[PDB]
Amino acid sequence: MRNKIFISHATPEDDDFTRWLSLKLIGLGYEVWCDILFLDKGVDFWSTIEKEIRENTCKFLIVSSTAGNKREGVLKELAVATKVKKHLQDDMFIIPLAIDENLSYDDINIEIVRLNAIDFKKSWAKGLQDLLDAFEKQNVPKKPPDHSKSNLLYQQIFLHDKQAIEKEETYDSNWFPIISFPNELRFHRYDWRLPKQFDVRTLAFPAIRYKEYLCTFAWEYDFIHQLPKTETYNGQESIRISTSDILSGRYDTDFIRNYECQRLIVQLINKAFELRMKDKNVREYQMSKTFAYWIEKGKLEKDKFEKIKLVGKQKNKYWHFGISAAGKLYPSPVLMVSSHIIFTMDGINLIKSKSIQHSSRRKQGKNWWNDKWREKLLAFIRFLSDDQNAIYLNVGSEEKILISNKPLKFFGKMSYVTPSEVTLEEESVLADINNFEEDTEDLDEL
């Protein structure tokens, strides 16, 4: 029999409403047919469609728009129904749908004009409501409502085209593993040798005060010019611990435990970084929690490195790409690099006001994309690399910690496929996000 319902969708212009309409009918129980419900690789179109209307359709729907009239494809599609019309002999079979105030009667085709229309411009819900009463009026052969059909078309017609793929891939990170450590980790019963007041942050080699001892990578000898009265120290008073037995967690003590040691190394790594840093000839910026370190203007060829720009031009300001750090031991020993954008009016000078830096970073940030950030983080590490492979962090006069510029890649089980250039609109929609950032306005943005 014929119970099916056809629709003519101008494309792509009226795809939105067109999409909306069909599904609502479908859940209720009305069989429907429209092209937007199928992607096509059948070489024919005309002959799968024109064929379709005559055989089964219980009613025909057009779309009155600027590109509803002007698009050829429908017109052919209506004509058949119109011709389609004679055989049934019933007008009620064909109904138009107008959705544009702008589309004009003169524009409306003559086949249309006589036709009696449902109006959607005022509101879709009303227009639709009119329609299923007319459907009710014709008693069109329609099963009781089943929306659970509808999303299965939605999950399959639309979700499928863009959805998560099963392809795996691998992801660079900001985690640089630690290439090597000094073999032993030393504690010193300097005792009377170190005054209680003294400040071990001041050491000039990474050293941490400990309950009865001072802890460092450094050999007891290392701390002389700043702390005398130490050559009096018998090195066998120094408790030494294997580096790798801390990492293994194999190490524990009545007086100490592995977490604690792990906790200690980390601090050292941090201090050991600040130290190595002044050597490197990059200017520094202090975050309230910690320092971050960045390059001054003109220290690079055309203010690039390995063809990658690191200080450029924002408005009346210069901006610079700088980084923080801290290490971790659990569940690997690696050096975690946070990225940062730090600005200068001279291009050699800081800006005093907190809020001007912060405000500035965000505005610049929107313009930036992951490839760029990855490209910039990953060049700022091949710069501090004493060797391309790694950067030497001095922790004892002859004791070093090494860290690789190749960061550790992560395996990815599930991926996606790349759309292009969309963000910039989103990204320039992010400058217009400096607006409804209101706390008194009860709204949150994306």
């Binding site: 609502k24 879709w124 929306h147 660079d172 760029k372 599930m414 790349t418 989103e426 008194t440």
Partner: protein
């Protein structure tokens, strides 16, 4: 080399039992999970503001389009989306004369300026609501921009507009006793100063101080700025609009209507799948910087069941701050009450205690507060404690091209700690959720024992459940998204005698 699992994007329920990832689509196709048969709008505001509401309200009946309707679902229009009709001609108007605002606004300090204006709105709202025979679902507060401008802390009203002169310094007002002289005439000026001083106890944000004041009477409200409603009109000297929504105009309409809807009293949607008897418990503190005791802070608990409607519990103000550690923790006595407050709400809600409770915060719990919990936790109840943080230390970059990793990837450090990519790319939306490269979050189970991977799923789901904003997902689980905002509302008003109240009373 450690590797990443992917968590399947969760699923929220809609009317008709359709289950969908995206609320915005989900509403349009199937509509709201439960349904109400109207929005009788109460409106408080100026003459001009009222029209702006009407003009906007009408507009939404029509469908509205964003610029990229792929990255943002288009808005079919209220009637079509919710069925229920929001009628611009079915309104209650308590007018606010410009000559009334003229009066209270031009005062030297914001606290006086803000309290007096807030006072003004409530007085109508309560007065209308209490007095009027006819019920109204939701009062709509139409905020002139001048009020928004000058009724926020740090707003500085130009001296040349001051029209009433403040009687006391900000510093001295919190230490003030009006006490009575033998001579009355003097007192008349003294009461004056007592009234002014009192305004420095209330917070100086119009939005928070009003919502907070309203808690006593349990009247829901939505607060929209005149600028937001008719953004095109407010413009800079250049004549550009100050705030431009042209690209996102439908999306805005999605937001307002939805939020309007829930406040109306029908929750649009609920999570599709949940284990039963699971209770989620949002912890919130705001250091009360006011008291001569430097550890004072406020104590708040925000319970979430499956729906995400929420419930809020007023905890007691005490020394929960340790400035040295910088975190907040609870003396046992208080801890006992909150759960008692909390489970006794659950039991009343379901007639049985939940099998499972998860508590969320951003600071590892101390041990002592934590066992104050077991002492009200019934024996049959698992009681887990979860530390969630937006750690900034870890980031995942993509080897080629400009798009981030897709949301839902996860790095499980160990069986109690793991990393979750609430942010990132969404294929469903064929664009991202932040302009910078995304920042995963860190989930640890600080106290109690529970599966790691289930809780990652547990939490990703709580991202879906933001009524106030209609969006694919929120980066924080709903438990904490509003933690400060709630904080600010409790501290805003003088006396927290408030019984626990539904979550729509805070937004």
């Amino acid at each position: 080399m450690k590797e990443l699992i992917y968590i399947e994007e969760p699923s929220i329920l809609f009317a008709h039992g359709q289950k969908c990832t995206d609320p915005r689509d989900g509403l349009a196709l199937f509509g709201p999970l439960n349904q109400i048969y109207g929005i009788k709008s109460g409106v408080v505001g100026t003459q001009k503001g009222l029209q702006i509401f009407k003009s906007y309200l009408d507009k939404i009946q029509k469908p509205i389009y964003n610029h990229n309707n792929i990255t943002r679902p288009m808005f079919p229009g209220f009637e079509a989306v919710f069925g229920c009709k929001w009628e611009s001609q079915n309104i209650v108007f308590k007018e606010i004369t410009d000559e009334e605002i003229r009066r209270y606004l031009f005062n030297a300090s914001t606290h006086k300026r803000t309290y007096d204006l807030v006072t003004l709105f409530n007085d109508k709202i309560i007065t209308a609501n209490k007095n009027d025979e006819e019920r109204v679902d939701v009062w709509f507060v139409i905020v002139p921009e001048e009020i928004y401008k000058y009724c926020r802390p740090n707003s500085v009203l130009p001296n040349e507009l001051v029209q009433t002169k403040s009687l006391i310094s900000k510093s001295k007002a919190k230490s003030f006793r009006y006490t009575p002289t033998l001579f009355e005439e003097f007192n008349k000026k003294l009461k004056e100063v007592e009234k002014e001083a009192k305004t420095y106890n209330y917070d100086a944000q119009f939005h928070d101080q009003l919502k907070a004041r309203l808690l006593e009477h349990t009247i829901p409200t939505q607060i929209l700025r005149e600028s937001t409603l008719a953004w095109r009109d407010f413009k800079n000297t250049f004549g550009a609009p100050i705030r431009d929504f042209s690209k996102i105009e439908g999306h805005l309409a999605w937001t307002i209507s939805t939020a309007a809807y829930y406040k109306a009293g029908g929750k649009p949607w609920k999570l599709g799948d949940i284990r039963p008897g699971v209770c989620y418990l949002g912890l919130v503190y705001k250091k009360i910087e006011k008291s001569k005791n430097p550890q004072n802070a406020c104590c708040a608990a925000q319970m979430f069941l499956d729906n995400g409607d929420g419930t809020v519990f007023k905890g007691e103000v005490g020394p929960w701050y340790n400035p040295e550690k910088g975190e907040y923790h609870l003396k046992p006595k208080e801890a006992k009450a909150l759960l008692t407050q909390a489970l006794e709400s659950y039991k009343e809600q379901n007639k049985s205690y939940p099998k499972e409770v998860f508590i969320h915060a951003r600071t590892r719990f101390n041990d002592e507060e934590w066992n104050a919990f077991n002492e009200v936790t019934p024996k049959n109840t698992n009681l887990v404690g979860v530390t969630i943080t937006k750690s900034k230390p870890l980031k995942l970059y993509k080897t080629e091209g400009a798009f981030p990793i897709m949301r839902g990837n996860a790095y499980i450090v160990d069986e109690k700690k793991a990393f979750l990519w609430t942010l990132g790319f969404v294929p469903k939306l064929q664009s991202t959720l932040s302009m910078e490269v995304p920042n995963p979050i860190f989930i640890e189970i600080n106290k109690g024992e529970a599966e790691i991977q289930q809780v990652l799923k547990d939490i990703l789901a709580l991202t879906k459940l933001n009524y106030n904003a209609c969006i694919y997902a929120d980066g924080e689980p709903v438990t904490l998204r509003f933690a400060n905002k709630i904080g600010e509302i409790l501290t805003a008003s003088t006396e927290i005698k408030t019984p626990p109240l539904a979550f729509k009373y805070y937004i």
